[PDB]
Design a protein around this ligand. Structure first.
Ligand SMILES: [Zn+2]
Lengths: 390, 263, 15, 605
């Protein structure tokens, strides 16, 4: 989440990131419940106050909210104890932020994201962009290993594909920022633009990438002014599930049919409908590719036709249980690398080695009755060194 | 979400008395503080919405239905609209010596129906917790008791909190009003430091008000008096028609003219 | 009374 | 014909889409498959029309699946639906048009009907035809000449070769008409049989009877109805309506007894007018007309006792207005099918509840008797309450380690006796039976292996029944199960699924299965479908458990066996583990007991 992203930052980058225009407001909106109230209170104070007052300024009931808010805002470093006055820079910027100082766009965003997903999947016809391809490859969801041949899709790629559009896009942009730092693009400058959206060379390239993703559209031959789409700021279902593992999806966009075929066997394709079967072959194929039953169940639930919404649960228990059992059977045999021991002359030495392995985290499994254990190869060197040291 | 409504009692007689006195506090600063409070309320969340009403002896008018200084566009629009409308209202006003007491019941009625309209229009998916941050600035009128009580009971039934913020005077009617609906009652004695009071006592919404320490409520004197005297009375002799608190047993209450039968 | 068994009322699969 | 990048066939360039597709709830695939919506407001009308012109293959709650064939279209024409009368409404209902392939198929199937009619008179089968060109171009192959015994043109045909000629015509594209004009028939006098007002006909029964009697002439076909739905009542009503000599064919002594009881109960026909042409007992079969007999006797191939020979000659000589055949799924058998040609009947109605089998001989029924007239909707009956709602479940029992070791180690087929008898399933069935016994639910345990059935029954001291069990003891055990409160469970063998009149049971556990037999699965499931006096559909009072052993061939057999039930719509819920099993004390709680059971299994040989 954005809270995680901002928490994973240093004070030096934090205070700089607290730009005047928007950041002080975007980070404010993050404040879940109560820290908003304290920020407004001590927005006008130039004198720090004791911590005991903040501690006792919440009733005995629901105190956990007080501690969690205080910890979150301490991590954000909005104030300093100074002994709890807010940062002067943040105070000034917030005062300046507080009385101081479309139908075609959404369709465009939808179409651009749909073509991006088409390229992500093995679609023969898709938008071509070397920068987009390499960006997705380095995002960790795609690997090519051969420039001549089109890149394939890694295990994480299918999991990313089956995610919902909001979370999918949010994770994609998170990876974009993480790779932006690696490629050398300043993180603060690009990050501030995202906050400003919800209200230089690097800026131009970043806006080009955002437009390629479909969040923004200049509409004027790449002019300075931009009109963000709905997705920039941050629908009914169509699948009907039977009790015989049969899916009838009212899909016209090829993306939905491809997503369903990823874990189901297609039987018929009507102009406004498609029939597929969820069989062991397809489900285990998806599981081997890397998906887990949770993603499939969530995908079918979110794309649930209104007809089956009346019944509770929406997805039939037999279908859900069958999918879960199919995924479990694949991982019945759990493989874990390790090194076995044999010929323990005395159990005292074995117990001492067990205690050492437990302390170091090396041990994976132990058997007192048989006087043996298993250690991962990483800890094999450590235990071997201990044995040599005697 | 939350729909806040600021009912400012901008009585020209009293505020101009302050202006003549040349006191530190002024109606301009009061309007600025109210503006800051509304801006902070909307600052709290996007879904939150606000409105403003100004009271005058004649009538009450709504003060509220790019980034030149690098400002948020919506709050900039709020600032401009409120400033222009308040200046217009204060600049233009007829003179009527007979009527000088500030009017508040009508303003609160306008508020209540406005909240009802917004509650009807808003989607049923999101629940709205409306509030009325009344800011009195002058003594109330005796003749307004009945209508003010009607609107207070309507607010109680409709579940709106009347947070009174009287200053320079303690209106027993207004404290009684907010007590009925459970709204907070704060009497700021330091007018220059009024805005700090808003950002603590009033600003937090009903959702978080319970889980927060706020000044204790003031004792309310639910007095009763006979229609003869207007003096406190502990025993009242009401009839079945007037429902009027009277002085002492009488053959017939004047306001009724009923043919009471002795016994 | 005459309520259905637990293992039929809710899925017994570990998920 | 066109295949997309995926498995599904492509029809983007095949047929168009109607603009008012949302209004139209019907789909039409080129292969003949039709997908109807159960949520559309016109669902009832669409269901009636699609049932009239097509046979269901899958009817889940939301989207029903039908497929039409030549036999279904012939049945539609028999009930009197013309090619236009069906195709115009099909196009109107269809939300994506009608492919030219289906159009031409419907036209050809409808036109190729009624040209050739088969009528039996004076013990002679004449192939009548108003059009003579049909016969002129039908006498090309020599089989017709060799078969034939050595306008409105008709010729006599040999009795024995009727089946061969009929199956030949089916692929010759000239189906024969078996309609019986019982209304206009003076050769055989009508029998004094009437339907008493006491009998009550349910709406689905009336609909099936109407589809059979689409016109004044009765149609010969197969009506599939659940055993608890009153198929016996439907057959009795059909015979009463026919008002001519009726020969009912059961499959066993219990079947013939039940048929006689149903006849007496629901028909005013006198007792003396009904006979039981049965070896165990007879009631002067030649004396009266309405007869009940058995396939085994009528098709008996070996020596015939003199009295039975006289009766058989009388039956062959006489002509029957109606030939009712219960449990038609066994008809395509050699001896059983020989009975069709052995006996003469105008219309041979067929009744059953599990019209499914592995060998592709079910298709032969379409010509052996006729097209499948009606097939009751099990889900709709459940909703209407005519049939008790069933909470179908499959209890997965993990196989014990040693048992799995021997099972996998041996490549022989002792596994049938091994995995059917494992400690985990034994404990599971014991715990389930205990839970239902304390719940006052009647239990009917099933097991194909008599050895395993006997072992389980002795270990649980319960009254197991099986083939060579004495009839008196069988009746005593059934009476005790029905009446004695102290006992509420009976362990029946395969004989149970064949034919019986057993009391309604609240649960049905199946520890073992004969194999991938949809017939057996449906037959055993039908036992608990008996609706209670005042139950409710949503209460799920009836339960069916099909215990299976994990990681064994039993899983494959169960999955292949539940196909018919899932097609009907029943959702089999999987139960990996049962709550309270650990706390409850059960047999085989120690390694030693499993060891002795394994040793006994190994010594079984
Ligand atoms: Zn009165």
């Amino acid at each position: 989440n954005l809270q995680e992203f901002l928490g994973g930052l240093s004070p030096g980058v934090l205070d700089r990131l607290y730009g005047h225009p928007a950041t002080c407001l975007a980070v404010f909106r993050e404040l879940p419940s109560l820290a908003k109230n304290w920020v407004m209170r001590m927005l006008f104070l130039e004198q720090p106050l004791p911590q005991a007052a903040v501690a006792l300024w919440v009733k005995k009931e629901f105190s956990k909210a007080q501690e969690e808010s205080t910890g979150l805002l301490s991590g954000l470093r909005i104030w300093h104890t100074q002994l709890l006055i807010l940062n002067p820079i943040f105070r000034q910027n917030l005062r300046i932020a507080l009385l101081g100082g479309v139908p075609s766009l959404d369709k465009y965003a939808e179409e651009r994201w749909e073509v991006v997903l088409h390229f992500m999947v093995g679609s023969p016809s898709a938008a071509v962009s070397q920068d987009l391809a390499q960006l997705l490859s380095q995002a960790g969801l795609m690997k090519s290993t051969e420039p001549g041949e089109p890149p394939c899709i890694t295990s994480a790629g299918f999991q990313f594909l089956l995610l919902d559009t909001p979370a999918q896009l949010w994770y994609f942009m998170l990876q974009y920022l993480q790779t932006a730092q690696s490629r050398g693009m300043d993180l603060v400058e690009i990050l501030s633009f995202l906050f400003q959206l919800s209200f230089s060379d690097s800026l131009l390239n970043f806006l080009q990438h955002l437009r390629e993703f479909g969040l923004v559209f200049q509409r004027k031959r790449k002019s300075r002014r931009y009109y963000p789409t709905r997705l920039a700021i941050n629908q009914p279902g169509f699948i009907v599930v039977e009790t015989n593992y049969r899916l009838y999806a009212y899909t016209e966009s090829e993306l939905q049919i491809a997503l369903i075929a990823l874990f189901s066997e297609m039987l018929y394709r009507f102009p406004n409908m498609v029939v597929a079967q969820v069989t062991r072959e397809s489900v285990q194929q998806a599981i081997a590719s890397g998906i887990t039953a949770q993603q499939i169940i969530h995908f079918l639930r979110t794309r649930a036709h209104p007809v089956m919404l009346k019944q509770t649960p929406v997805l039939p228990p037999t279908i859900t249980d069958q999918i879960r059992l199919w995924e479990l059977e694949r991982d019945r045999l759990r493989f874990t690398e390790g090194v076995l021991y044999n010929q323990f002359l005395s159990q005292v030495d074995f117990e001492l080695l067990l205690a050492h392995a437990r302390e170091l985290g090396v041990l994976v499994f132990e058997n007192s009755a048989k006087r043996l254990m298993v250690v991962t190869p990483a800890g094999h060197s450590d235990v071997k060194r201990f044995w040599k040291r005697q | 979400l939350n729909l806040l409504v600021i009912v400012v009692d901008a009585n020209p007689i009293w505020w101009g008395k302050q202006a003549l006195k040349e006191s530190q506090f002024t109606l301009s600063k009061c309007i600025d503080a109210v503006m800051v409070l509304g801006n902070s309320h909307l600052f709290m969340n996007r879904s939150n919405k606000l409105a403003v009403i100004a009271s005058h002896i004649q009538e009450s008018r709504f003060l509220y239905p790019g980034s030149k200084d690098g400002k948020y566009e919506l709050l900039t629009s709020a600032n401009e609209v409120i400033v222009e409308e308040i200046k217009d209202l204060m600049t233009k006003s007829d003179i009527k010596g007979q009527h000088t007491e500030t009017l508040l019941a009508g303003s609160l009625a306008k508020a209540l129906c406005y909240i009802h309209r917004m509650n009807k229009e808003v989607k049923d998916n999101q629940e709205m917790k409306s509030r009325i941050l009344v800011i009195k600035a002058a003594e109330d009128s005796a003749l307004q008791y009945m209508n003010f009580m009607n609107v207070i009971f309507a607010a109680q039934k409709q579940n709106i909190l009347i947070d009174a913020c009287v200053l320079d005077s303690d209106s027993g009617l207004l404290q009684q009003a907010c007590d009925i609906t459970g709204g907070l009652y704060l009497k700021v004695p330091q007018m220059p430091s009024l805005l700090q009071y808003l950002l603590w006592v009033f600003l937090p919404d009903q959702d978080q008000r319970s889980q927060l320490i706020l000044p204790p409520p003031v004792h309310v004197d639910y007095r009763a008096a006979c229609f003869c005297h207007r003096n406190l009375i502990e025993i009242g002799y009401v009839c079945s028609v007037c429902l009027s608190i009277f002085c002492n047993f009488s053959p017939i209450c004047t306001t009724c003219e009923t043919a009471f039968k002795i016994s | 009374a005459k309520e259905r068994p637990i293992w039929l009322r809710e899925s017994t699969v570990q998920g | 014909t066109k295949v997309d990048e995926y498995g599904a066939k492509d029809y983007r360039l095949q047929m168009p889409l109607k603009d008012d597709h949302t209004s139209r709830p019907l789909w039409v695939a080129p292969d003949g498959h039709i997908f109807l919506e159960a949520f559309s407001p016109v669902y009832k009308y669409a269901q009636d029309f699609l049932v009239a012109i097509a046979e269901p293959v899958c009817r889940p709650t939301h989207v029903h699946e039908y497929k039409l064939t030549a036999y279904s279209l012939y049945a539609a024409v028999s009930v009197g639906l013309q090619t236009s009368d069906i195709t115009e409404y099909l196009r109107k209902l269809s939300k994506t048009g009608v492919p030219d392939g289906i159009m031409q198929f419907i036209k050809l199937c409808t036109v190729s009907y009624g040209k050739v009619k088969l009528v039996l008179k004076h013990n002679r089968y004449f192939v009548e035809s108003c059009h003579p060109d049909v016969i002129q171009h039908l006498l090309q192959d020599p089989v017709i000449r060799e078969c034939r015994l050595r306008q409105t043109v008709s010729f006599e045909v040999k009795q024995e070769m009727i089946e061969e000629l009929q199956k030949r015509c089916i692929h010759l594209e000239y189906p024969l008409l078996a309609e019986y004009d019982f209304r206009n028939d003076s050769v055989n006098p009508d029998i004094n049989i009437d339907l008493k007002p006491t009998a009550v006909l349910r709406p689905y029964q009336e609909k099936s009877l109407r589809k059979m009697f689409g016109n004044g002439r009765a149609r010969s076909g197969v009506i599939v109805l659940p055993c608890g739905a009153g198929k016996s009542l439907v057959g009795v009503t059909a015979a009463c309506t026919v008002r001519k000599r009726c020969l009912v064919l059961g499959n066993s002594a219990v079947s013939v007894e039940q048929w006689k009881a149903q006849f007496k109960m629901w028909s005013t026909i006198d007792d003396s007018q009904i006979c039981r042409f049965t070896s165990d007992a007879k009631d002067k079969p030649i004396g009266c007309s309405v007869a009940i007999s058995t396939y085994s006797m009528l098709g008996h191939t070996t020596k015939r006792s003199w009295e039975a020979e006289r009766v058989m000659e009388w039956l062959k000589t006489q002509e029957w207005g109606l030939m009712i055949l219960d449990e038609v799924h066994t008809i395509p058998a050699k001896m059983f099918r020989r009975v069709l040609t052995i006996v003469q009947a105008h219309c041979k109605l067929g009744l059953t509840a599990t019209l499914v089998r592995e060998d592709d001989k079910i298709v032969d029924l379409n010509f052996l008797i006729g097209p499948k007239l009606y097939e009751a909707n099990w889900m709709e009956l459940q909703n209407n309450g005519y049939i008790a709602k069933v909470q179908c479940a499959e209890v997965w029992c993990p196989m014990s380690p040693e048992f799995y070791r021997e099972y996998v180690a041996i490549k022989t087929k002792k596994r049938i006796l091994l995995y059917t008898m494992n400690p985990n399933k034994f404990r599971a069935c014991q715990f389930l039976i205990k839970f239902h016994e304390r719940r006052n639910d009647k239990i009917i345990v099933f097991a194909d292996n008599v050895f395993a059935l006997k072992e389980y029954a002795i270990r649980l001291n319960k009254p197991y029944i099986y083939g060579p069990t004495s009839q008196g003891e069988r009746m005593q055990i059934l009476q005790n199960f029905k009446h004695n409160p102290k006992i509420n469970t009976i362990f029946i063998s395969k004989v149970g699924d064949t034919s019986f009149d057993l009391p309604e049971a609240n649960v049905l556990i199946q520890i073992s299965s004969h194999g991938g037999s949809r017939r057996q699965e449906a037959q055993r499931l039908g036992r608990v479908l008996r609706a209670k006096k005042g139950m409710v559909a949503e209460e799920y009072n009836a339960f069916f458990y099909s215990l299976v052993s994990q990681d064994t061939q039993e899983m494959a057999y169960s999955t292949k066996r539940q196909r018919f039930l899932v097609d009907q719509g029943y959702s089999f819920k999987v139960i990996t583990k049962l709550a309270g099993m650990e706390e409850e004390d059960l047999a085989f709680s120690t390694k030693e007991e499993q060891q002795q059971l394994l040793q006994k299994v190994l010594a079984a040989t």
